[PDB]
Amino acid sequence: LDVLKSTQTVIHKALEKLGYPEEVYELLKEPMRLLTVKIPVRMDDGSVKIFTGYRAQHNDSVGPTKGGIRFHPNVTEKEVKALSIWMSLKCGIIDLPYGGGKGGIVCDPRDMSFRELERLSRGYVRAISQIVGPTKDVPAPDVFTNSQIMAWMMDEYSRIDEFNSPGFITGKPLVLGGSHGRESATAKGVTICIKEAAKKRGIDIKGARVVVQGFGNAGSYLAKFMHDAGAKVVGISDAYGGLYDPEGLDIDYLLDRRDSFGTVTKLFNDTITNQELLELDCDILVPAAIENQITEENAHNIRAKIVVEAANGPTTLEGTKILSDRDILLVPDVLASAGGVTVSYFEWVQNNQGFYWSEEEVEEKLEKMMVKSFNNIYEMANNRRIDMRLAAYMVGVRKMAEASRFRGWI
Amino acid sequence: LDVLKSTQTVIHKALEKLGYPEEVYELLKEPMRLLTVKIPVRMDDGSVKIFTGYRAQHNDSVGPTKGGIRFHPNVTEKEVKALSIWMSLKCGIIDLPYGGGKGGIVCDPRDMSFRELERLSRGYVRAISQIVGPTKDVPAPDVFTNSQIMAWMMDEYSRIDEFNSPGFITGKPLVLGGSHGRESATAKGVTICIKEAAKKRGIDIKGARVVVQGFGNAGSYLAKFMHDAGAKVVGISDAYGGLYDPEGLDIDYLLDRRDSFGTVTKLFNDTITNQELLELDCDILVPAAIENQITEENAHNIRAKIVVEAANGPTTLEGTKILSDRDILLVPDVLASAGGVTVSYFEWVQNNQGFYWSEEEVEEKLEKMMVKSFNNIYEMANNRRIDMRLAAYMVGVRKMAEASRFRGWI
Amino acid sequence: LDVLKSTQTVIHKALEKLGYPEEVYELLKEPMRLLTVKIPVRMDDGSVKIFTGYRAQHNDSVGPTKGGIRFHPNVTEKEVKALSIWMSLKCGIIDLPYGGGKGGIVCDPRDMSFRELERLSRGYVRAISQIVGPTKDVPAPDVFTNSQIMAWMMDEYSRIDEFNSPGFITGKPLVLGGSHGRESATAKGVTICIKEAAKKRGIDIKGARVVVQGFGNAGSYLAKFMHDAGAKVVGISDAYGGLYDPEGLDIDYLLDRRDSFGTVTKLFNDTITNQELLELDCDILVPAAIENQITEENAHNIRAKIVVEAANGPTTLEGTKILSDRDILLVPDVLASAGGVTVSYFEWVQNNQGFYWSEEEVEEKLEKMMVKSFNNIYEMANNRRIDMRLAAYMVGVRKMAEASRFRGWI
Amino acid sequence: LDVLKSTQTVIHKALEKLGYPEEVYELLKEPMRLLTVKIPVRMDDGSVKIFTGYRAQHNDSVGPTKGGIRFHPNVTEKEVKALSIWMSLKCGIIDLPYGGGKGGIVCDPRDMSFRELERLSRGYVRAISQIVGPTKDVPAPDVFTNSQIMAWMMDEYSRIDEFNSPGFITGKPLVLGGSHGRESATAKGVTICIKEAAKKRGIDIKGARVVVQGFGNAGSYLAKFMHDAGAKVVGISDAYGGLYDPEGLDIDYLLDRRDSFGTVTKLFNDTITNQELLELDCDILVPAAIENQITEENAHNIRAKIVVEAANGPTTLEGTKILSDRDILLVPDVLASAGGVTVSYFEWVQNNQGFYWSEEEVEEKLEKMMVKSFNNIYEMANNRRIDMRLAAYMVGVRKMAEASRFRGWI
Amino acid sequence: GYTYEDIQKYLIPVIKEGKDPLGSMGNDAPLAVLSDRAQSLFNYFKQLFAQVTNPPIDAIREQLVTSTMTWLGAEGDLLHPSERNVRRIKLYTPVLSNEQFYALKTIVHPDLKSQKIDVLFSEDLERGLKDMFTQAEKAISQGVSLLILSDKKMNERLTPIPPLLAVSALHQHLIRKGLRTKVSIIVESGEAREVHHFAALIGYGADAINPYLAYATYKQEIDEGRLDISYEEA
DSSP: HEEEEHHHHHHHHHHHTTTTHHHHHHSSSSEEEEEEEEEEOOOOOOOOOEEEEEEEOOOSSSSEEEEEEEEEETHHHHHHHHHHHHHHHHHHHTTTTTTEEEEEEETTTSSSSSHHHHHHHHHHHHHHTTTOOOTTTOOOOOOOOOOHHHHHHHHHHHHHHHSOOOGGGGOOOGGGTTTTTTSSHHHHHHHHHHHHHHHTTTTOSTTOOEEEESSSSHHHHHHHHHHHHEEEEEEEEEEEEEOOOOTTHHHHHHHHHSSSOOOOOOOOSSOOHHHTTHHHHSSSEEEEEESOOOOOHTTTTTOEEEEESSSSBBOOHHHHHHHHTTTOOEEEEHHHHHHHHHHHHHHHHHHTTOOOHHHHHHHHHHHHOOOOHHHHHHHHHHHSSOOHHHHHHHHHHHHHHHHHHHOOOO | OHHHHHHHHHHHHHHHHHTOOHHHHHSSSSOSEEEEEEEEEEEEESSOOOOOOOEOOOOOOOSSEEEEEETTTOOOOHHHHHHHHHHHHHHHHHTTEEEEEEEEOOTTTTSHHHHHHHHHHEEEHHHHHHGGGHHHHHHEETTTTTTHHHHHHHHHHHHTTTSSGGGGSOOOEEETTTTTTTTTTTHHEEEEEEHHHHHSSSSSSSSSSESSOOTTTHHHHHHHHHHTTTTTEEOOOSSSSSBOOSSSSSOOOOOOOOOOSSSSSSOTOOOOOOOOOOSOOSSSSOOSSSSSSHHHHTTTTBBBSSSOOOOSSSSHHHHHHHHHHOEEEEHHHHTTHHHHHHHHHHHHHHHHOOOOOOHHHHHHHHHHHHHHHHHHHHHHHHTOOHHHHHHHHHHHHHHHHHHHHHOEEE | OOOOHHHHHHHHHHHHTTTOHHHHHHHHHHEEEEEEEEEEOTTTTTTTEHHHHHEEEEOOSSSSEEEEEETTTTTHHHHHHHHHHHHHHHHHHHSSSSSEEEEEEEEOOTOOOOOOHHHHHHHHHHHHTTOOTTEEOOOBBOOTHHHHHHHHHHHHHHHHHSSSSSSOOSSSOOTTOOOOTTSSHHHHOOOHHHHHHHHTTTSTTOOOEEEEEEHHHHHHHHHHHHHHTOEEEEEEEETEEEETTTOOOOHHHHHHHHOOOOOOOOSSOOOOOHOOOOTOSSSSEEEEESSOOOOOHHHHTTTOSSSOOOOSBBBHHHHHHHHHTTTEEEEHHHHHHTTTHHHHHHHHHHHHHHHHOOOHHHHHHHHHHHHHHHHHHHHHHHTTSHHHHHHHHHHHHHHHEEEEEETOOO | OOHHHHHHHHHHHHHHHHHHHHHHHHHHOOEEEEEEEEEEEEEEEEEEEEEEEEEEOOOOOSSEEEEEEETTTOOOOHHHHHHHHHHHHHHHHHOOOOOOEEEEEEOOOSSOOOHHHHHHHHHHHHGGGOOOOOTTTTEEEOOOOOOOHHHHHHHHHHHHTTTTOOOOOGSOOOOTTTTHHHHHHHHHHHHHHHHHHHHHHOOOOOSSSEEESSSSTTTHHHHHHHHHHEEEEEOOSSSSSSSSSOOOOOOOOOOOSSSSSSSSOTTTTTTOOSSSOOOOOOOEOOSSSSTTTHHHHHTTTTTSSEEESSSSSSSHHHHHHHHHHTOOOOEEEEHTTTHHHHHHHHHHHHHHHHHOOOHHHHHHHHHHHHHHHHHHHHHHHHHHOOOOOOOHHHHHHHHHHHHHHHOOOO | OHHHHHHIIHHHHHHHSSOOOOOOOOOOOOOTTTTTTTTOOGGGGOOOOOOSSSSOOOOTTTTOOOOOEEESSSSSSSOOOGGGGGGEESSOOOOBBBHHHHHHHHHOOOTSSEEEEEEESOHHHHHHHHHHHHHHHHHHHTTTEEEEEOOOOOOOOEEEHHHHHHHHHHHHHHHHTTTTGGEEEEEEOOOOOHHHHHHHHHHHHSSSSSOHHHEEEEEEEHHHSSOOOOTTTT
């Protein structure tokens, strides 16, 4: 209900800290291009259903907008605008030549079918075809979207434009112009941020104790990366509980027994709950799981020197304040989870060139980009006695404000 | 009370009477395109102001949308959508190859300057340039908008498209591709409606006892046109009351140079009977002073064999039903005030052809079009045993529904 | 099997008579743009079927190609090319600013369904979208095609091009930009040709005896037009037989009892077979029915002074030779049945202008065009002692050859 | 015998082995676009000649089609379609973002003049300009076509599109946007294939007893490249017979300036053993003299541990099966001769980027690409227990099939 | 058929103790076929056991011998297997949570397709089963690899087919027609709250089950104050 207001508040605070006037905030608080469309879709039963779609473009001064499309019944204009602004912030943090964009459709994919989903995706692409393209707006997947939906959208756009346009949409399969590293991008970015934070704090990664809350794809890849780097993972968690071993957890065996959903717990063995998993003795803590897990009660009980928010908003304002008081280095999600956006940008670059890179090239480029962003944010937060979250917000808004001023919009 | 909800309701009943499924109403109740934009404008003081703009497109099945733009501070998304639906209804009634369109900007031109207005119009065109054009969306003027603004918009679009595009926007001056008959369009339309109604009935235009609640601009024009052949009985609602009460006497031609700003025609101190006179045994009635003058209480009091609406919402549903029961002809405003839209369509045709017509050609084509529309509405109303307002609504929605069904959207 | 060879032969003969060199024949014998495409269509059962589509464009020197699309299982490249050349001949005869085009799809609409037909039409439009448009190629309907299919194609093209394109395809419904007179066009053209031939031969239309073989829409409209003009229809035919009355046949009552398919015969009443209907005593004979009806045996028995080939190829070479020997004026189909093409051209003009004419305007314009074409052909065939068929072929090829020479292609 | 039917058969068996439905074969057996055009060309004698041209596009699911053009009088629709399918297979094997394309013109350049060839190429480009471009179809050279023709085509397309389009066509000179390594592409590709095959096997490149049936252009180049490290045993089929028979002896470098037109390298009167020598205990074999040199009779006679095909159809199915049973490695020609396509792809990438690479970069990228393709083919062949030719065919068709399924065409 | 006793003595104790609740004084009530009251089809089927010719085992003590791994998808070429045989989903537990069920439904992957069949009937149970069979065959022909039998969207007019009967009938039909190995069966039924129910469904063909109604009951108990443990842990 207040997501847009909160985003506006953080934008205002960042602009005030940077010293920009109020006209910049007036321009950047709301997107300058919001489109609402009605999509008629023929269903399997033969009836026709009218779906509602939204597409918001926060800014285009830096470059073409970059956004995602989510198929949820609770989507709203306010949510779409707020997430477009957040995407702009992420792009500015990573220093991409992108703006912020966000798409949404009011639907229930659980009740929808394969052919109905294809028809809905095509209809949405048609409705927004007038303001999107490889040079205007680049969509990607979000909740209840995947490579098949991206491929359907790409086919729709090519069928409209009379020529193939792989760069119009990212998140595609490899055969259609996808990029390697699309699955381990977030985990690799989190690993890079963890390594940089450890270097800054003097903690040696070799033998460092890491706890990961969440063993999905991101959690599994992150645990594998720490194990390869030499850090010891002393705790993992899944939907059924967690495990604890100060001397190591045998990540190889855990991954071998890992199923599709990421379950690794045994049946007749007691498990460790997340509440006391977060309180374990470790140097690095990584919540990549459900949000609102760190609060006042557990902030003092947390024993981690570094906390990295792999998931979205796993920490509250009070928890951040307490961690800052306790001198615990917090890595915000807006920075940690930018690996997916970076890999989508690499996919766009590959589509533009016609040349597709390899896993090693993607790895090294992502490493350099994330390291530069992390170092810039850390230097900003050291020069100004503020938090990394505020520093990241300022870094995100600076590029957009400067581009708008240079182009003369304000 | 809600204008949008009232429009959806009238569309629903018209479609139900026509015998269409509910999916047609679901499609036509809400426009399929709603673009919201933010326009930065540099004011004369060196500051920058962000203006909000809306553009609604309702249905493109029949053809390119045609819509006016109004510069008012009270515009809203719901109002814009409702006006787009009403424009679609008018276009369907007149049988134009157009759809429903509308636009608006939240601004106060009374406060804005000439250069500021030029910049605002140019920015609006730049913002909506992607979804407008001679083949997609044709803007036109509305309240607080005029030919200078239309010319600025035309220049901006021509610069964007790298070639002259006179047909993109209507309401232009003659030098830039304007059309004759723009000023007298609405008055002429009501005159043809009155003449056709009289011809359909047994009344002639020689005596033609005419009651008018206008005497301002349109009322004065229609009274003057009637005076050539018909007569007058009483004039009401001249911004001061029943200042005119010939009661069986005519009025000398006084349309040379006169306005209501100072007196009405001769002197403000002349005898005044009262605010509302009405009544009297007349044969033609033209109520246009305020919204909803006719109510249940005075529905049976009027003694006019023919009533022609010249304002917006001058009569209620109960009054319309009472008049229909009494067998008094009632010409809806949606049909009476279509002359401006017809003339804009003629201007669009002239721009497309490259050949510009004369006043006589415009007049004769307008006569043909409005006579055909009136005859179709009257015949369908007689066949269905319904009122003229409902008949007009059904005639308007029939074209859109049939086009959508043919194209396969429903 | 030899349709293309026959068309090539008639083109060669016409060019030889006109005196053009052999390079003109080499250019005009085959189309300069033939496209073969494969259309994947998802069927109701869920399977995928690959259909084969062809699109041929004979010439474009005069202007955009004009053609038709037929949904038949026996379509072939040779047939498509030959019919494109025939369409070019028709356009040249009528003096239209068009070329020749022809589309075809290998399918069985009888076994296909409504949704499958829609999908196939959309797929064909997509496959040929790269070489067609309002300025390149204008399709129309043919065997197993109608206004719904044309509307589907138009929707597909607009959905591709991001703006409505009514002029891309003709044969549409009125609501989507169709033209009046689309049903009586062929009959009206046949009537015009009959009247001109009677004027040339000195036969007075008043009281002239007319026999019509075929009482479909064309036959019924033609009979009505003759009855209105004053000529007496002494014979009509349907799928079950024919009637004969030298003093008149009560066309009003026959049309009143006419069903959808055109049957007017009684049940327990003996009828007149077509073989002896063609031999009836009359001044005007009009076969608008199955082909290969006039041959050597019945050519001498035919008692008609004027014969008009409303249908396609109802006469053979031997029959034409015998009629020429007997001094019977033969009006070829390529000229008589051009009313549909002319009305499609009028629809294209209306789409271009944005202004849609009326039945009277269409009637008068068609009258002038057909009268001019008939007079030109008659004068050519009188100046050169040849047949009207050869004169029409020469008139058709002259414009195309001159345009190619002027543009420098030969 | 029919090349098209053979191609359809190999596609069918590859898809069956991969485990795909029959609709995939139905889609991929025939190209989805076949444009036939007639080009008028003004010859130097003032006459006009009509040339026939064909352009086939097989599948655009993966990306824009890439195809060569050949100026031969024996070209045909079936040949063009088969070559387009083969090009698609090669692109899939190399993992390029291309589809299958091909073009041809029925002409005899040996008879045509320089200006006539320029005019013909320009006319071909003008004819097919609607369905070609950097994003749709990329032409390239083939037999009787060269960089001058490519440059003329590029100039014509640039004039049509009003801007420079270097990436529309490949094979251009360096000044116009050409790429290095074009000449030695095929020879280099066979060299990398040989080196990778030897590395996979236990053979080293020091001794490397090499038998070659070439000694003409490509054969001489590969022999020279091998001579740096490996040795030679015998050379066969030098256009005159077994003129070279060292039988365990090397050959001095004689690639400075020598050709087979006059003698071979030293003298034509040197001792000649016979036409076919073969046999001998060698470790590398390179047969490229004529089509189908290896048959059932001599399949078991060869004594080479590795065979690398460098010509078109040098081996039959029975021979391939015999070699596979004997466990002799066999590198298919479709993989061996992909260097030219890879270099054309590099040129396209350079045109898109605006940055042009060097010989070293081209060489290293070619090595990486061909090594990856060879490794993938070898691994898949080992996993499926099949031959390298079938493995290559399946690898080629897998990308196309997966792209089509993802896009929803089947 | 939920009851206050059922909830308070089977669902809450399961959360509290991590095991099936114990009891004493084995069943003295009549069989389902003899009881006047309407009974679920589950109660008509009795679990068998190993008495002689084969012994039972201790799963807890010999957990290294047991395996709950389940495969979802289509089996590859058994005689000539390569890669594609393991291009499927695998689960450690046949019981599916709501989020897992939604993810499986929304996979969308062309190779891994899903189709939902509403196992509901009004008057003709045989007709309902036959429509389910036809829908399954149509989905298999289209390429679907997951069949989701749902009892949801049921009202007074449409009653849910007994899930045990539906699963068994579909399993037998697909086995007869040689298509079972190409698909997997997910059940979304409210009549699944007991170990006996889950075991019967699995043994008669169900690959996975989703007790949405039991989850909803747990959520209601949590919301109304009781069962302080959170929804996810429950």
